[model samples]
Target chain A: LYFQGMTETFAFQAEINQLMSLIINTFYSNKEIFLRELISNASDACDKIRYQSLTDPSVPRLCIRVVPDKENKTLTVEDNGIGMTKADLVNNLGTIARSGTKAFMEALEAGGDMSMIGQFGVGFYSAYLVADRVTVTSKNNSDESYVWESSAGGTFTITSTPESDMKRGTRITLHLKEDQMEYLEPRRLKELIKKHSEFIGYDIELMVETTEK
Target chain B: LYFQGMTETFAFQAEINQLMSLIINTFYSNKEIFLRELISNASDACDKIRYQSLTDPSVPRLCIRVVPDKENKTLTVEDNGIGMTKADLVNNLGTIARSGTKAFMEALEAGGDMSMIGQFGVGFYSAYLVADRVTVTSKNNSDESYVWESSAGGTFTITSTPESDMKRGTRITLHLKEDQMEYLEPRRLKELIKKHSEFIGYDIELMVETTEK
Candidate 1:
């Protein structure tokens, strides 16, 4: 059985507000680019786990799954890699640090090549561009499962979630905004995933329900 | 008549030294670009005078002269456009304005096209790149002629020079360094002028003397 709770949201920090304005207004002119950046980041996370497992042969095999729930109006990106702890989610999502998103955009303008990943630590924030809210439920082998909720504005909330049956991985659910409803279509989402993430070095499975017209 | 006198030359101010290094290393990469920048500046001066004469038909026609002395290893770029007064020289050359150069380079990077009669203010510093010492003599039509000398480091010495019988214009003399002696050659100088300032929209004549070998 699954349960849902009331949605909580808040404004972003002043700096993050300015940063979002910069990104939305200047950087990504095309809305489609959000998919490319997100897919690229997922591929990188998979690569990181693969490299780690090579050094420690006992590490678990890693993969990413994209699950779309048409009825619920949500999309989930689940990764069986090094999952984030509660602190990792807070530090990564709640604060901006050295060479933030603004610097990343500037580097892009200055003719930087995009093939290099993890250059700008702000690729995660790009999820906010398409989703109205995000919930990240992560379980690390070393820690209990935790849920991080944020509205992309600076403020975020983290709470301990029951880990009785939670697996050791991360499940990021995107509550799509009204304008992003098209992302719920299986065909459209599949086309995008194949185009940008075909070369991604991971087993990415798309779980979609099909119906005949 | 023209005369040359030895004067005490001082290093540029600390701030000017910093600016010079910044310009040399960060802004400009090609050394030959200095010639184009200077000639463009001279052409603009002539244009300004011509434009002013459009309103007051009685204004005298203006011209700029560029003299290169290979024997003495000196090159001079002079103009009759609005010559600077002693105060103008002090304010422009002595202390650096915060908004001046940074703004100009920003505009240039933003695709600002170059003008034959280019912007005058900060360009004079380009002279220091090729010459060890630079001297300027100017008569502003309203004020008496003055001489300003500097050795590229930024500190400058300004004093009144005896009035000459020449017209109200400015004369700049560059004491070329040993490596910069090539600028003194008439052929090289002409080629440079033709390449950069050919479209300067002015009569640029090269005066050369042939000696029996």
Candidate 2:
């Protein structure tokens, strides 16, 4: 059992910080890659649940949503794949790569094989390339609805969210940093989604609220 | 001013796992780089205190020791730098780099042709590439010696080491992973130190206990 007592807060292991720095600075030299990574992760999550439903038809409906809040300059990626429980959030988001996603991508890239693309692990960290803080709300069929929020510091806050507000999907809100404001534009976001993830057979839409002049 | 609460047991930020996978699988290409990172950090700590002495002549003297226990296959790097008060360890080790250290390094590197090599903030994560578990014992001038141990899963334990056995320096013990047994050899370690840090201009020695047949 990987279970242990919990602390209110914790430090990020040293290497994790370096990895974050690398991603923020080097990995996604193109700022648009942040959207690509999120979309790829969402597609993979959707594919995973879809595969699981073949055996257990009672699985939750899986879908991905990207909401751009232009007023607040925030872009959010939400999905209903395997929503994390509080412990899962604490363990998953709190620690570096519990899912072994990053290494898989590194291995694939190192081998010069881009054929197998959508790896969920390293793609999640790409969120840091554009945003300052991220908040995730998820509901797993096996667990209660929980809210996991972190500024990507070694510490994160995991608390119970209202089940009424959370369906059986995960919602990630990216507080776009000043430099990442361009992502808030609906046209740019749609262009990106259509370009990289159009093959993902999900109901893709861009929700933009505008004032009536 | 950067003090957070004291937590020997803390969860790693999720990206840390990705960072570890990157370090272990992709970043270093060579396992020997782990030793260089650890030693370089130790040397930097020593240099920091030495620099501090220039401002306040009453600062304590600094030293570092690297010991490899071939029998147990563990390598330890110890240093007497600005040790952590409980909070320092929690905050420093538990957080991600906010402003890009890579950008900082690039700026410094380009500023005036200054000798700037350290850019990746992920050095601490590199230790995970070679060691399964890392144990750190540290003492600040104002605090007691404490031990921080983790298997690189992001969560770590911090406990007090008995004062009788504890000293003034930070001691890092790397429980070498299966493939890292080569680091246990004295000749291999000495060769690395000479290759990467021959210009260190400090006393470095290898302690290998030999049995008379």
Candidate 3:
């Protein structure tokens, strides 16, 4: 237990505010990027875990799960990979300029077998283009699981997650805006995944809700 | 005369630096945007002048000229439209987020009759994608002519242009990077202009170098 503090709220820096403005306003022509960006991030996370497995045998089944909760009006992309610590959450997700994938790739020098996708570090915020609010739950090998939630207004809240919540990965749940309810369709999600991320090395499963007998 | 000052060097703000990194490093897949972006901007400048001509008849032939200098390894996009004052240079070109076209369109309220195209101010910086340096010479009705130059190296210089140098409008000169010499070819330039900007309301003339017998 490295960071054992109470739930904390932090405001986005000026660079982040400016980036978000561009994402939510100017890039209106490309709303499909929201799902694409998240899927890319998920793939990157898996690549990271795969990279770590080279040294640590304990590291390793790398897959992405996409769940479209129509009842809750949410779309969740889950990845079982090298997640994030609380500080990683604060620095990577909260600070728009700091990119975990970029840093990891840089550390790997020539990206070492991993095909990292994100470089701008602003792709995650593309989620805010459609979702009014986004909640991220992440668990790292060295730290406890935590949930980071933000409406992207200015500040975000980080709270501890239950041990049962996330085993060893990250889960991003986007609360789709009212008009963006189209993302709640599993069929549409499947179409987007097929179009943008069909070539990804990892398997991306789109959960289809089935009626109970 | 609004800005009468010696050549001053100013460093890019944090947000701009971050944005430049994204443009130079991440958007490698879309180098064609460099030409398309400049053409869009030139068209937007014409739209601005067209909008102004509605009330001010003194303002008015709006055309874009594309000049590729094979000898100098440079590409220039010139426009006969409502130009910019030195303040406009500092605020519009220098400030990566403040899109003059966006502001003007907002003022137009439904954008009036003009079809303004540039909503993101960062399009101008896309020149750095193919060129190592960019120089912009602008002359506005309200102010004296001025030139802004940058290598996308962090800081840029702005100098007052001689009265005889420019009558009106803007001229952007890009010193193409060694690897980007393909943009200097007239055939390629013509193809790009035809492919991207043929439908533009104003005529875009690609200057063909002629030989004197």
Candidate 4:
């Protein structure tokens, strides 16, 4: 059990390293599909916030912000939606090694598609398709904000964030791998959203730094 | 954590009831396919035993026995193969409610086939398609024989069985549902086996009770 006001580190469930390798290298047929998975997750998070606001309308407006920092070589998808508690981070993202993972891998090797990850509920791991490291910063309504960081390494760290540092919802930042620099291009992201998530419910703003200013 | 030599009862993971309801009601289009799912699991167990035997030749011969009891309206798939430990019973069968379950359910509702369960690895729950309850008695090499039983009533029980009463491997008994009496017919089973698992690796003997003494 974990307590508040503390930082905790946990190992990815067993077999996670192998699973990540499969996802990063051979899972999805198209690398750009990673953006679709992230956008889908962002959409769901916003939906959750809207549902939670049914009784408590004080929640923040639903929206997804895509911030591509070319200088830092990072792509961040931030949502002011239903944020995850520390436990949710561990249970949802931390533990991917269940019976399903084995079945999924076998299916993939047998020619199943990586979209199958959406069915298996591990599409979040697709972030590894373009990034070596992923940092998830989230703030649940009932708890303080926390940061979850992992490099698809054997372990991840969850550190508590200061109250003033974050509002409710989740922010996922992917540290683009050297070869995945295309994700840092704003035009590529716009084309992806236009092709895949054309009718998404919430506003998706792409924040790009302009050199002209 | 659980200890040996004692019985324990556990509630299925949160949302297990909903998932089971989905599996039993709308997930699988063909009810007879439950036989295929069970056979696949038995085949895996037999394979495990065979692999384990490479290191330890003293293990029993790997085989699967299918017993159909018409009078009792139950179909049993027994395998003298690599069995399960107490913890395995809980973790493998008990905790089906992960992030993937939600994804699987949504996919199914969106017209995804129940065969997706094979890829998602929850194919074991297909037993409920033909039976109201299922009982699994297993003896892992490193642990005592244990009985795992569930009626899909939101909970399951794992009880220790006397060592003398059981042998190595696993025996799964399905208490057939009222409308599912056709599964207990030997002719149906034989035809299904021929159509589906015709080329299975291990010997599959269908045990039929004799009418005459």
Candidate 5:
């Protein structure tokens, strides 16, 4: 439940509130929804960074890459998006928080658009719909690179991944639960990608090949 | 703020509360987004009806009809999908409701899978994304036909649209704000449809159009 440069032990706001069990134990049966939610979050995140490009620095590129590892039984959704700083990471991920997405959807924020999905921040938690454990790494030029790791059940640990090493974006990797190898099947992943992700306004690279294959 | 049935002359949950002025005065912008939202709602509605066909009555047909009246400067979005009963019209339209979508989404609902698009029901309100006044008419076999009408910023009125009138579903007509006649442009409407609605699991017909040409 921890990662690299340890800062402090923090608890998820939504978990303290029991939304952990609300979503996790209550619905372990949903598998691919985690992929859908991840892509959507990646898509929403890219929308902002691309949107940010128009207004200013645009230094942050817009990209989405899905990498699958069978040996490790892991799936990573990475995006060069509106790279969140340490606070944004905590507020956006460490907790199932929507003070961010809610205000965004209500269009209360001046630049917010209806097209940006994630009206309900819970989309991220859909990760648990497939994986038993999850780790998040992000880099923001405005701030620094940071990491957050958790077991879909109880507590999560957050740190600065010594590593954005120098990237301005987020890479969320999920450790698939046992018997969840179907997600690693490249064919199924492609079909689901064509079903939803292909048309979304972003990029996707098949970071493929089973480690066992 | 009244209905013919007189169950109660209530305002929308969003209106009677702190959200009244929230999105009310925000923009005269975002015209096509209204069409996008309506068609998606229609698509989601049809997805439900068709998905129902796999299970039960699916009494609702799967079609969305978009009728635009140039003289009146208005647009109508109608769908013969899952019709809403009286209480449904109120709860679904009154509050930001999404139990079915939510249940299917969180996997709390048993028959859940890839067929649902509206995990959140806010897309319907994007009606206000284009119009000043909106009138909703619906018919459900379980109940009857009812009418809900409102001017974007204030309270809304809901009533029986005439004891069912033999209708089978829902129709939402928008009185486009005066300066926004471009929405009534047929060609543009088609493009928007193709962009978001047509590919999805439903049908949307240009039910009617301007007589001038």
Candidate 6:
């Protein structure tokens, strides 16, 4: 059920727009939450590949990196755990679209560990808190690399790009909006890992990645 | 649209319960958010009444108090801000179906201030993060006192109680579920005020209240 490999734009549900408006303006209330939300998403992505590799342990390096490029006006959250395929990008990001984290949260409700943080899929949208625009580039071994970009305009475009080139995982870059002055600093990035408190930073190695699995 | 004088229970739209469960069960991911969410609601309630009293200026004691009763197994967040009428309680608490906070957030997106806080009002429901049941007692100057109680049981009861006889404002009690351990301490309550960051010791005052109030 693949689309014929064409760059396309799609409109989000009306609720998505309200959800953004609901979160963004009030979001500055706890702007740090935007970082935690992204990290939670990253940590879970890393967790996904770990669980998948229970039998076949060839799953790639599981590391997360926070690259806040002020010059570029973007914050990049990259993880080399499980990558997203073109379809995964469309369904998870664009569409109520749900996510692998769906069961992850349900499991938590059914008495999963207090560790491993994530959501019923609303978490990823928290990017809009500090970003007027968001770009996600992902690669899954089963599919080619692609990029998805969107603004608050409620429409997003998916394009085939060699974004992953040699890498395999999902990379999200936030084009910072106004008033996120504090989060733009590298030192602040270091503190955010500490903010998650219990769920992160123990068995984790922090490093930026090149485009390779 | 106010119902008669006796204590009573009403059914919630199946959707309201879903939103609660969808959020509550997954809420442990960031349990601290429950306190912050309630505080945010309290702050906004104060903000709402303050804005309304710009000309009237008869707003009662607009302060917030956190009463954690380990013996009683409840955490009460009381605020003598803008209370609710019986109808306001049902429509606001039972339905979630509507609130002035809807446009309050919309106004924020249209460039409102950092001072007021709240949403179309799901923030209050975050109480379920630590509580299996929640009781909201409100007293609006325009109407009599009332109490709204629910346990994620898909429906809530609204009773005409002596809740507001002592004074006015909204009082929320969280009947803590097991393992909401650290959140049960008075010291932890101090930290929640810190979570708001902008609201140092000035705007918020913490204390407990008798149920008869």
TM-scores of the first chain across all predictions?
0.77, 0.77, 0.81, 0.87, 0.78, 0.77
Return the lDDT, model 5, position A9: 39
Which run of 10 residues does model 4 chain A get worst, by summed lDDT? A1-10
Tell me the spans in candidate 2 whose CA falls farther than 4 Å from its real position: A1-7, A93-120, A161-164, A210-213, B1-213
Encode model 5's per-residue lDDT on B36-146: one tens digit a residue: 767777777667667777877635347788899988888999888777777766665533444433333354245632223234555465566567788888777678777
> Candidate 4 clashing pairs?
none
Residue-by-residue lDDT tens digits, candidate 3, A54-171:
8989773689999988889898999998899988887654434545434533544654322222455556877877887889999999898888888766677677634345689989
Q: Give the Å error, residue A91, model 6.
A: 63
Worst 10 residues of 2 chain B by lDDT: B112-121
Q: What is the lDDT of residue A110 in candidate 5?
A: 65
Q: Which structure is stronger by lDDT: 3 or 6?
A: 3
RMSD of each: 24.9, 19.6, 21.4, 23.4, 25.6, 23.6
Q: Which of the CAPRI classes, incorrect, acceptable, medium or high, describes model 2? A: incorrect
My TM-score estimates for the predictions, one after another, are 0.42, 0.44, 0.43, 0.46, 0.42, 0.42
Summarize candidate 4's per-residue lDDT along B109-135 as a digit string, tens digits.
798877766666667788888888899
- lDDT for each residue of candidate 1 in A1-213, tens digit (9 for 90 to 100): 111221222345455555455443443435555566666656666676678787987655567788889898998888877677755665554445334655665676788643221367666556666676878887776777777777644466555533246787788888887887887888888888888666777777888884589
Q: Which CAPRI category fits model 6? A: incorrect
The interface root-mean-square deviations, each candidate in sequence, come to: 36.4, 10.0, 20.9, 14.4, 25.9, 24.0
Q: Tell me the tens digit of each residue's lDDT in model 2 across A67-161.
A: 99877778888877766666666566444363444554466568733222235355666687788788777787788776666686656655542
lDDT of the structure predicted as candidate 4? 0.77
Output the worst ten-in-a-row residue range by lDDT, candidate 4 chain B.
B1-10
Which candidate, 2 or 3, would have the higher lDDT against the true structure?
Answer: 3
Interface RMSD of 5: 25.9
Poorest stretch of ten by lDDT in candidate 1 chain B: B1-10
Provide the lowest-lDDT 10-residue window in model 2 chain A: A1-10
Model 4 agreement with the true structure over A10-76: per-residue lDDT tens digits = 6666656577877667644588877777888889888887887788867745788999998889999
lDDT of 1: 0.63
Give one digit per residue, the lDDT tens place, for model 3 in B1-213: 211134555666655655555455543655767888888888888899899888978874688999999888899999988888877777554434544434433544654322222344556767778888889998888888888887766667667534346878889999998888888888888888988765689999998785589
